[PDB]
Write a protein that binds this DNA or RNA. Structure first.
Lengths: 218, 426, 1004
DNA sequence: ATGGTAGGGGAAGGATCG
DNA sequence: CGATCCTTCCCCTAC
């Protein structure tokens, strides 16, 4: 794992080799943003902004994408809550329990499933508020999504309204699949997409399907 | 499958993707349209986008054995691979001879009803119907399933094929030689021409077919056809001093484009010598052999249409034979019987006059369409009164020439059917 | 209460509503709020069989539900169209759906609202103050608008307010960033309802020293520290950046009728909002008239860039989310969608707009004075030039040297401007706006008072150019005409395509004729292409050429043939000639020609060899009636325009007439589009076939026509090519022309809606007179029904390069032999935006010279051929050797729209390299000025070093003393190709190019 | 929220067979 | 004693 030094706060970011050809640019984009980004409190601490940079991208084929971290108790890992209380994670656990049949759920950590990387479009948000760092993270988010989509095979974005033009934000349409958010809001109400189109799309491209059982916590 | 899963995320597309090896043309265009619309969709994006139009089954087969090889021990099922026009299908469609997509429809309604829609797993994945001339016989299926079950049991259940699929536990690996091959042939107890024996053991899909070359060198005397029935005749070439020498030439008169007379190489195994069809190039002259065949027959039996021209036969009776009704000598009796018949009236009202006459005279489809498209008519009162040729290039084909020769009888029968239709509904 | 409507807008809150903004006679603005319903159409049985009455229902009457599904037939046993008549009902539901089985579901809710309630979006009405409820000052609520808008009154003039603004922000090397770069100047062009025009520029004082600020204050500028101390009556105001942003926020929050900017949605407004959020944290909030909804600025994007193939990712539009009236108009998108013949950087937008004379008065030192008046070149151009000169700084009088304005004076319908340039003795000029050659980055590093004042002047000039462009194009009249013609809100007339805008009048026609045409079968996509491209008969035309044009050929064909989806009795196809003959014999008897019309079409499938579509001409279908209404109303508006006196009426009628032209011209394309409400494959193919048949008929009758003894004798009989008629078929007619006239005619070229005829004459007056006589005789005698032709112009020195590609001189019909012709090119490289500027001039000169020399050679074909070849070779060799002397121009343009496979892609790689480093950052879909020759390619041997590898962009810089960027002679070989279209004897052509380039030139 | 296919001209670039 | 020039054969871009 390589390391880089930035001008502001943590002074040290550790990243895997798979993120090599963009990391420098990220710093070139980060410093300016940092000058304003630390002006306000953020739900993720700055030390956990780039925790996901250590995950390799060579053995990943499905990329699940959100819009922002949780407004409170930001762990750094997207869609992660080691207390089974967040709305999105418990809804996803209930859906996967209905679809598969596994019972006795004590956690659904998604970062441990092989071939699936949890990703957040915006790496930070205002504490106790909605997404308020869209202008700051815009170019960084675009760069990171472009880097990720060139390694993974399928992209599954959560939120129809938020990703209404996700195809315009990415020059290469690498299997852009947009799904409804687990938390229904903003003229939307849907919770059951059967969570199985990803696997069949995977063997439609001569790729091994991903089992939705390695993420369970006992 | 909440929102129909978009047809189970194109279940038919996936089936065609895995079925390219045993698919047909219409499914190929359907799959092309499916991928074209799926690559730009709110619920599906770009796919592998691979296309193919040639039907091949060589992936499920192995190399042919040409010597008394040695076999591994185990239980074996011996399959008498016959010598006929192989057809592959799963239901009342397909039945394509390795590329001849839907050449013609076999009129076996009982067979079509008997065959289950996707029997067992996927309808044994193909039937391997040899159809030597017109007799239906099933063969290997390669599909695993179990083997002593529906796959091989369908022939015994419905009577399509004589039961020759029964064997015993063999084991005790021995060198497969001529003696065992002949013993298995005699144990088959069949009179149909057999060309190969394919062994299947429990736990495999691809079998190594065995065929003894036994290259013989024989001379050709003459090529003569013998009639067995309406499109049931076979151009049985006779070589040497009247030997039988089997030749493929199934229904359609191709693969018999061998040089007349001269010296040839043949293959014989126990009783039925078979020569090459198209493997040995040599000369492969076609114009000379077609002209010699036509001249020997007597200017009849057009090659492309695999049938014989109705020279001299005007009509008024061939319509009855084609419609499978009682023989009649007058138009009034024909009309009365057509009215009385429950289904002949429906079939004559549904079809057109041109199609009815074309099927009555047994003309080829494409050749007759082209010949009509290069002609001029003088239609009067919805009947043909005078016809002429405009382009004489199409006359280069002898089959087109014979069809033009019998076009007079075609016109007479066309007028007769038009008059019958006018007198029936008007 | 007399009111004139200005805008209709909705609300995207919890509860939807429809708002009317209108103005009374005095000037008071009135807002009226209507409920927003979802409209459905059902039959009587469906309405009665639905248990809970959802919200409301009103009857329609007896209507037909004709089926328009078309299927091919192999015989003549065509039964009938499935048509049923039943009582219809209209259902209003506030929620999304309450029927699920509606027959009419392809129309918009706003069109239903307007047509059912009988409301014109731009009509003057007399509101009744009894169905309205006061909820807040200046707002009313209406529940039954059916009778609240019953009375209509003639149009009356009302005042309007506008706001035009521009921005400038500091930058070091290239495009600024809101996180690091502040704003320096913001200009405003406030126009109020009272008509007062206020120009004022806000200047940031944070970028100036204390002594410079004191000097600026002492010399006239105003300094403020709060919003309350800002006065709009002062031109120059000095303040801090926070106060600047707060003043901009306050201005944009007021209810203006229009807010017009140039590329303001993407850059100006976005920059203002982002910087205001960064510095303070507040927001620019728009509130609804009823004070129930509030939103912020969030510029969203519309990616409607697909003209079914013919576009490079076209362009993405940017819009604002204001929920008040406040029509935010962006001239960058409007001009891009309007004109496609220039570059879009606010430097050459209006150059090709005006033409006026700039007669020189003095040529002393560097203070030349120019004059302009209506008596010099034309009327109106001088007034516009004087109007735009009030704020201009650099003036163009058709010179390419750029001059600074010293003194300006506005006299009675004229201007007097003093330039600063080296003296030169010219006599006539062309007057248009100019460009400023200043370096903002160089000016920002050393910031002083003079630089700030000059920048403020430039900003106010741009803000005023916004208004000048708005007034020149007549955007307001176009918006009103679009609202009147297209049944749509006034704020969405330029943002939709033909498939959406035609649903209004179509719905009106369907309701008035009681037709509910419905489709019940899946549509199959298989294009018929069409072709119709005609090969020109000759390559060079020494003799004169006349032009005859069809008056709206396709609408007239659709009316004549009654081509509608509901009039198609049936289509008959045949796979062989026997059945084709049988079907033709049965068809000529079953459907008599006097009533039915049979049109032959190209086969849909390869197996088919014929296809005949039959149309009944006694039921007055939908599309022909719509086209007839459009044409009649366009003629009425043109007559009213020619009969009007006041300028406002002239402008209104002129705006309406071309909107009707546009709506009439889009029907033919719509009939061939699958996702249209007018889709009909057979009707479109039949329309194309009948158009081709009419073109062939006119070409055949016009070809080989003589004018002997004052008699017009046609080559073939004048007969209807569709069915027998009672009209005379004699090919000889009397002419009201002198007996001494002796001429011959021949058809050389044809188009979709045009025909070219050849006359063996050279005079222009005689040609014009004979063309008028031919137009009269052909209109009266040759054509039939509603097919009329018109004599457009006389074409001289016609040169045909390829199909749909020619260059010639044009004399208008209302002109004489002494009138000056106009050079006209169609498809020539001179109209391309990516060839050159020197190449166009050179090919123009060569074409003119060669045309003159072939007009008067004059020995014979081969002698003049070799003479032209040698002369052109000598001239091109003399102009080939540049003897150094680096010239200007040599500049090309292209759009950054690759978005393709990565691979290498040198064009995409070239742009992205400069964007990431510093210079020439081009966005997506923006044209840039570069110069490409052999992008890292070596085709042959050059002359000097650093020539073939030249691929630099260069936006405004000048190449240094080692670039020498002149090698465009490669494409100049088109002249040789032009010689292919002009002369024979390729041997001379090959030798010269082989000597110079040696690349085996392609002949033809 | 959506008109539409042929024709033209520049140029890589291996195939061509020189 | 020699290789060239030939046209498709493609990708990109403009009416």
């Amino acid at each position: 794992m390589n390391s880089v030094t930035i001008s502001h706060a943590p002074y040290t970011i550790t990243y895997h080799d798979d993120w090599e050809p963009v990391m420098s640019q990220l710093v070139e984009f980060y410093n300016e943003v940092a000058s304003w980004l630390l002006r306000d409190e953020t739900s993720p601490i700055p030390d956990k902004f780039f925790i996901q940079l250590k995950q390799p991208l060579r053995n990943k084929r499905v990329c699940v994408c959100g819009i922002d971290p949780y407004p409170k108790d930001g762990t750094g890992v997207p869609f992660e809550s080691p207390n089974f209380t967040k709305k999105s994670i418990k809804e996803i656990a209930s859906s996967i329990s209905r679809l598969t049949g596994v019972i006795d759920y004590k956690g659904y950590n998604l970062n441990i499933i092989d071939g699936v990387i949890p990703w957040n479009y915006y790496l930070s948000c205002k504490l106790g508020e909605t997404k308020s760092h869209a202008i700051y993270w815009d170019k960084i988010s675009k760069l990171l999504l472009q880097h990720i989509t060139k390694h993974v095979s399928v992209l599954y974005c959560l939120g129809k309204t938020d990703f209404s033009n996700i195809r315009a934000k990415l020059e290469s349409p690498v299997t852009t699949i947009v799904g409804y958010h687990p938390a229904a809001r903003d003229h939307q109400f849907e919770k059951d997409r059967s969570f199985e189109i990803i696997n069949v799309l995977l063997e439609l491209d001569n790729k091994t399907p991903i089992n939705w059982a390695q993420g369970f916590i006992y | 499958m909440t929102s129909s899963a978009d047809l189970t995320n194109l279940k038919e597309l996936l089936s065609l993707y895995k079925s390219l090896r045993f698919s047909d043309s219409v499914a190929i265009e359907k799959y092309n349209s499916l991928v074209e619309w799926g690559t730009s969709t709110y619920w599906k994006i770009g796919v592998q986008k691979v296309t193919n139009v040639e039907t091949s089954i060589s992936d499920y087969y192995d190399e042919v054995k040409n010597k008394p090889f040695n076999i591994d021990p185990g239980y074996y099922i011996f399959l008498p691979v016959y010598f006929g026009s192989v057809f592959i299908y799963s239901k009342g469609k397909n039945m394509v001879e390795l590329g001849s997509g839907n050449s013609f429809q076999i009129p076996d309604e009982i067979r079509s009803a008997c065959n289950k829609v996707l029997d067992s797993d996927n309808g044994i994945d193909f039937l391997r119907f040899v159809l030597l001339n017109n007799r239906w016989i099933m063969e290997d299926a390669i599909s695993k399933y179990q083997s002593p079950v529906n796959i091989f049991k369908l022939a015994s259940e419905y009577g399509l094929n004589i039961p020759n699929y029964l064997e015993i536990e063999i084991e005790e690996d021995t060198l497969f030689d001529d003696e065992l091959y002949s013993i298995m042939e005699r144990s088959f107890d069949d009179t149909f021409p057999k060309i190969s024996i394919s062994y299947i053991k429990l736990g495999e899909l691809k079998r190594q077919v065995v065929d003894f070359f036994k290259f013989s060198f024989m001379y050709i005397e003459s090529i003569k056809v013998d009639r067995i029935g309406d499109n049931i005749f076979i151009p049985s070439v006779i070589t040497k001093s009247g030997k039988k020498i089997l030749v493929k030439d199934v229904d359609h008169l191709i693969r018999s484009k061998v040089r007349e007379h001269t010296f040839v190489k043949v293959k014989k195994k126990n009783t039925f010598s078979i020569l090459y069809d198209y493997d040995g190039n040599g000369t492969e002259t076609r114009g000379e052999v077609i002209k010699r065949i036509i001249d020997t027959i007597g200017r009849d039996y057009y090659v492309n249409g695999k049938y014989f021209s109705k020279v001299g036969i005007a009509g008024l009776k061939q319509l009855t034979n084609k419609l499978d009704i009682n023989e009649c000598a007058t138009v009034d009796e024909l009309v009365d019987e057509i009215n009385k018949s429950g289904t002949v009236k429906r079939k004559i009202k549904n079809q057109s006059v041109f199609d009815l006459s074309r099927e009555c005279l047994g003309y080829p489809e494409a050749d007759f369409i082209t010949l009509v498209n290069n002609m001029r008519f003088k239609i009067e009162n919805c009947k043909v009164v005078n016809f002429n040729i405009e382009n004489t290039n199409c006359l280069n084909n002898p089959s087109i020439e014979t069809i033009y020769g019998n076009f007079n009888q075609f016109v007479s029968i066309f007028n007769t059917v038009t008059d019958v239709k006018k007198r029936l509904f008007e | 209460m007399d009111v004139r409507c200005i805008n209709w807008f909705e609300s995207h809150g919890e509860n939807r509503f429809l708002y009317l903004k209108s103005r009374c006679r005095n000037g008071e603005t009135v807002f009226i709020r209507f409920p927003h319903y979802f409209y459905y159409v059902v039959t009587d049985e469906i309405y009665q069989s639905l248990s809970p009455p959802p919200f409301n229902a009103r009857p329609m009457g007896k209507m037909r539900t004709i089926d328009i599904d078309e299927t091919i037939s192999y015989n003549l046993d065509i039964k009938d169209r499935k048509c049923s008549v039943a009582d219809m009902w209209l259902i209003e539901e506030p929620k999304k759906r309450s029927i699920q089985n509606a027959t009419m579901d392809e129309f918009f809710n706003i069109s239903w609202f307007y047509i059912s309630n009988g409301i014109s979006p731009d009509g003057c009405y007399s509101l009744d103050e009894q169905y309205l409820t006061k909820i807040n000052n200046g707002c009313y609520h209406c529940d039954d608008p059916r009778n609240c808008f019953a009375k209509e009154i003639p149009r009356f003039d009302i005042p309007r307010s506008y706001l035009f603004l521009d921005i400038e922000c500091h930058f070091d090397k290239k495009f600024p960033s809101v996180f690091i770069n502040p704003i320096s100047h913001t200009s405003y062009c406030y126009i109020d309802l009272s008509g007062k025009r206020l120009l004022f520029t806000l200047i940031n004082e944070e970028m100036l020293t204390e002594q410079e600020i004191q000097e600026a204050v002492d010399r006239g500028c105003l300094r403020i520290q709060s919003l309350m101390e800002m006065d709009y009556e002062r031109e120059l105001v000095l303040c801090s950046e926070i106060v600047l942003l707060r003043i901009a926020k306050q201005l944009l929050e007021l209810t203006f009728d229009y807010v017009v900017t140039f590329n303001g949605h993407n850059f100006d407004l976005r920059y203002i909002t982002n910087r205001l959020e960064l510095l303070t944290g507040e927001k620019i909030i728009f509130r609804s008239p009823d004070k129930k909804e509030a939103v912020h600025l969030c510029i969203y994007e519309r990616n409607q860039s697909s003209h079914k193939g013919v576009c490079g990712m076209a362009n993405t539009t940017f819009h604002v989310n204001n929920n008040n009236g406040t029509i935010f108009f962006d001239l960058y998108s409007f001009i891009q969608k309007s004109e496609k013949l220039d570059s879009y950087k606010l430097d050459s937008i209006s150059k090709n707009a005006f033409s006026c004379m700039g007669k020189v008065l003095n040529r002393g030192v560097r203070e030349m004075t120019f004059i302009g008046d209506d008596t010099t070149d034309a009327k109106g151009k001088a007034d516009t030039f004087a109007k735009v000169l009030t704020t201009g700084n650099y003036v163009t009088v058709d010179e390419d040297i750029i001059c600074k304005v010293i003194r300006k004076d506005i006299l009675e319908n004229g201007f007097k401007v003093v330039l600063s340039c080296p003296t030169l003795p010219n006599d006539i000029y062309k007057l248009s706006f100019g460009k400023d050659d200043i370096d903002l980055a160089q000016m920002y590093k050393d910031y002083n008072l003079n630089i700030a004042l000059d920048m403020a002047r430039y900003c106010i000039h741009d803000a005023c150019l916004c208004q000048y462009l708005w007034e020149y194009y007549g955007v307001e009249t176009k918006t009103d005409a679009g609202a009147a013609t297209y049944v749509l809100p006034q704020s969405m007339v330029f943002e939709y395509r033909a498939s959406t805008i035609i649903k209004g009048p179509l719905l009106k026609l369907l309701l008035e004729t009681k037709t509910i045409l419905v489709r019940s079968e899946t549509k199959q996509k298989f294009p018929y292409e069409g072709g119709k491209v005609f090969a020109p008969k000759q390559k060079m035309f020494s003799n004169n050429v006349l032009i005859f044009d069809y008056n709206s050929l396709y609408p007239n064909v659709c009316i004549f043939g009654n081509l509608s989806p509901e009039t198609l009795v049936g289509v008959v196809v045949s796979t062989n000639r026997l059945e084709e003959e049988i079907n033709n014999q049965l068809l000529l008897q079953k459907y008599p020609p006097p009533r039915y019309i049979t049109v032959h079409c190209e086969p849909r499938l390869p197996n088919l060899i014929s296809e005949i579509a039959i149309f009944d001409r006694s039921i007055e279908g939908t599309i022909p009636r719509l086209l007839r209404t459009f044409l009649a109303e366009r003629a009425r508006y043109k007559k009213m325009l020619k009969q009007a006196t006041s300028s406002t009426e002239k402008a209104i009628y002129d705006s309406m007439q071309y909107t009707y032209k546009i709506v009439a011209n889009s029907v033919y394309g719509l009939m061939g589009f699958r996702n249209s409400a007018l889709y009909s494959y057979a009707s479109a193919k039949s329309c194309t076939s009948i158009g081709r048949r009419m073109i062939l008929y006119l070409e055949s009758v016009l070809n080989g026509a003589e004018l002997s003894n004052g008699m017009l004798r046609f080559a073939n009989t004048l007969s209807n090519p569709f069915y027998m008629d009672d009209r005379d078929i004699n090919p000889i007619v009397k002419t009201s022309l002198p007996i001494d006239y002796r001429f011959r005619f021949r058809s050389v070229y044809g188009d979709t809606d045009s025909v070219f005829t050849e006359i063996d004459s050279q005079d222009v007056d005689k040609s014009i007179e004979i063309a008028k006589e031919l137009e009269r005789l052909i209109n009266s005698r040759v054509l039939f029904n509603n097919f009329k032709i018109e004599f457009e112009a006389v074409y001289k020195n016609l040169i045909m390069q390829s199909k749909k590609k020619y260059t010639t001189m044009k004399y208008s019909a209302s002109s004489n032999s002494k009138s000056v012709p106009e050079r006209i090119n169609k498809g020539t490289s001179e109209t391309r935006r990516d060839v050159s500027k020197f190449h166009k001039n050179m090919i123009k000169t060569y074409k003119t010279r060669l045309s003159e020399m072939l007009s008067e050679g004059r020995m014979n074909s081969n002698q003049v051929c070799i003479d032209i070849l040698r002369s052109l070779e000598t001239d091109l060799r003399s102009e080939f050797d540049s003897r150094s002397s680096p010239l200007e121009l040599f500049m090309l343009s292209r759009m950054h729209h690759s978005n393709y496979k990565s691979a290498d892609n040198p064009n995409m790689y070239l742009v992205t390299e400069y964007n990431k480093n510093n210079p020439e950052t081009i966005e997506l879909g923006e044209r840039y000025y570069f110069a490409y020759i052999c992008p890292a390619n070596v085709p042959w041997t050059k002359k000097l070093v650093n020539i073939k590898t030249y691929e630099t962009i260069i936006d405004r810089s000048f190449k240094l003393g080692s670039n020498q960027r002149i090698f465009y002679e490669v494409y100049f070989k088109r002249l040789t190709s032009e010689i292919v279209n002009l002369l024979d004897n390729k041997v001379l052509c090959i030798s010269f190019f082989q000597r110079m380039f040696g690349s085996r030139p392609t002949f033809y």
